[PDB]
Amino acid sequence: MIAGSMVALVTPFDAQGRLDWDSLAKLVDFHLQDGTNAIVAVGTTGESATLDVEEHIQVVRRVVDQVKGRIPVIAGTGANSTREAVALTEAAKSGGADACLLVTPYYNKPTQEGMYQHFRHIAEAVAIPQILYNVPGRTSCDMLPETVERLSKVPNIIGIKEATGDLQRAKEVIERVGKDFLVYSGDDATAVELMLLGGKGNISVTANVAPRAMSDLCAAAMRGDAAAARAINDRLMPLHKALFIESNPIPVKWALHEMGLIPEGIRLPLTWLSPHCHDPLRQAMRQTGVLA
Amino acid sequence: MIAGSMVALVTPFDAQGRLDWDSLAKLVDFHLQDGTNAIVAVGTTGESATLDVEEHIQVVRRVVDQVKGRIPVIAGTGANSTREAVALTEAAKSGGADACLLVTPYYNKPTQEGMYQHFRHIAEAVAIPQILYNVPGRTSCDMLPETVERLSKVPNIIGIKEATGDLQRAKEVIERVGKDFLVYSGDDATAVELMLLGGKGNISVTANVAPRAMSDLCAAAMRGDAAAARAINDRLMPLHKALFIESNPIPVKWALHEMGLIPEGIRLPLTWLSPHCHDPLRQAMRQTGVLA
């Protein structure tokens, strides 16, 4: 099943721009060990935008391969076109993915009715669980709760990743959708309370540098042990803010390279963490016990 | 050298979704005859997000073919992947296009520095004039005037399509760049005042349904007839509003179909103009003399 701490995995690049399979294998091993519950391969954090179509499947497959099915693999396959949305998804299903994360259409701002027709079609063309992703902070698009209720009732759409960071939003949604539709967190800062409200997981960025603490945090929350959930979330707060000191995944990539897990390497337009933000971030990793 | 009424040309589809060469030809004769100063194919209005690449050079070709060097043909070519961008520009060039319109990387949220190295890379790579495109409301990112400044000093980058609709941002860009770097309006409602400030043209949407009137507006505003320009704009406001009553391409197509210039066909995730919006837009087209 799909729940708990899910890492939105970064996809490493060597200095000249290619994919480092060694590293990806290290990361998978790393999360596989320290307690991660799932892996969101090739997502926003995965730097999908700048990926090739071939590089896309070559990865989804490699992770599934290395997971031995010990853990579920969620693949990003959302496009702002209905057509490539269906295509990318057909791919993830072949590569061996267990479910897909699809972003609401960016740049072209649908109608709510358009969003509904968009996702519905994609759900009737590829038999595989689908997880809706809402983030107007990037798509210049907000999928309202009515449009969410309406889609939650479609055959193989099993949940939603909510990034707005607005708790009242994720509370109107839990209310409007059924008992087995799953609402996940997008915002790492507020994930804990979203779970305490009835959430079922966090599609985390911080989990990249601190997977084990995130597993713990999700356990405490989904049990209703708010006392503990918040204790950990506080000792991570420094991290949650530092990793967005510059657009994701520019910061988290850097931290990962600092721990010796991934090489310096990120594709244009994204750039490498500005010197500006080195001390501020490095200190956080120290405050956090990921680096001394 | 490329200035004035410029049409963000739509891209005809038939009820089934396929392209309608019969209709594109007419739209081109319409603006040809009526006096549009340049055509911008495959832009946001041209539904650039839902065209296979193959479909995208095909379109440019048959427009370039038909214009036959009479007026400038500008091709929309921006991707949020720098690699994918040089690819589309290379294609547009090798299409016969005269220049390219490139939108800032949407959804992936570049730093100002990344935005900079993104555009120079492309200007370095493809020997063809390039016109920047800033439109935050659709991208969720934003090219500070301070970055446009740096960029204006690069060889084959000769202008920007500023679409914030903020008239101070304009009073700003114009002040920071040389007179040979041209600032275009990307917002129809206020394009008249931006030209009065030193702007040289309006990549317009209204122009699809009222090309002659837009030339007249652009001409008077560029000579200095501030009284004449605002009088024409005042006469066209209801239409500027009506064309954006539901998110862009949608309204303008409905209009065009009503004039009998294009098929009822628009690709998902975009939907056909919802029923409510029919009489507020039909009356506008009438209140402003394009419909009887």
Swiss-Prot record, chains A, B:
Q: What Enzyme Commission number(s) appear in the record?
A: 4.3.3.7
Report the CDD domains cross-referenced here. Answer: DHDPS
State the name under which the record lists this protein: 4-hydroxy-tetrahydrodipicolinate synthase
Keywords from the named record: Amino-acid biosynthesis, Cytoplasm, Diaminopimelate biosynthesis, Lyase, Lysine biosynthesis, Schiff base
What organism, scientifically named, is this protein from? Pseudomonas aeruginosa (strain ATCC 15692 / DSM 22644 / CIP 104116 / JCM 14847 / LMG 12228 / 1C / PRS 101 / PAO1)
Pathway per its UniProt entry is: Amino-acid biosynthesis; L-lysine biosynthesis via DAP pathway; (S)-tetrahydrodipicolinate from L-aspartate: step 3/4
Oligomeric state and partners? Homodimer.
Name the catalytic site residues: 133 (proton donor/acceptor), 161 (schiff-base intermediate with substrate)
Q: What does this protein do?
A: Catalyzes the condensation of (S)-aspartate-beta-semialdehyde [(S)-ASA] and pyruvate to 4-hydroxy-tetrahydrodipicolinate (HTPA).
Catalytic reactions of this protein: L-aspartate 4-semialdehyde + pyruvate = (2S,4S)-4-hydroxy-2,3,4,5-tetrahydrodipicolinate + H2O + H(+)
Q: How does activity depend on pH?
A: Optimum pH is 8.0. At pH 9.0 or above, only 30% activity is observed.
Notes on temperature effects: Optimum temperature is 37 degrees Celsius. The activity decreases slowly when temperatures are reduced from 37 degrees Celsius while the drop in activity is relatively more rapid when temperatures are raised above 37 degrees Celsius. In this case, the activity reduces to almost 30% at 52 degrees Celsius.
Indicate the transmembrane segments per the record.
none
Q: Which family does it belong to?
A: Belongs to the DapA family.
A molecular-function term among this protein's GO annotations:
4-hydroxy-tetrahydrodipicolinate synthase activity
Q: Which Pfam families does the entry link to?
A: DHDPS
Primary subcellular site in the record, as a coarse category: cytoplasm
Where along the sequence does the record put site: Part of a proton relay during catalysis?
44, 107
What are the subcellular locations of this protein? Cytoplasm
A Gene Ontology cellular-component term: cytosol
Q: Name one GO biological process term.
A: lysine biosynthetic process via diaminopimelate
InterPro entries of this UniProt entry? Aldolase_TIM, DapA, DapA-like, Schiff_base-form_aldolases_AS, Schiff_base-form_aldolases_CS
Tell me which HAMAP family the record gives.
DapA (MF_00418)
Chain positions recorded as pyruvate binding sites:
45, 203
Keyword Translocase among record annotations: no
Specify the superkingdom. Answer: Bacteria
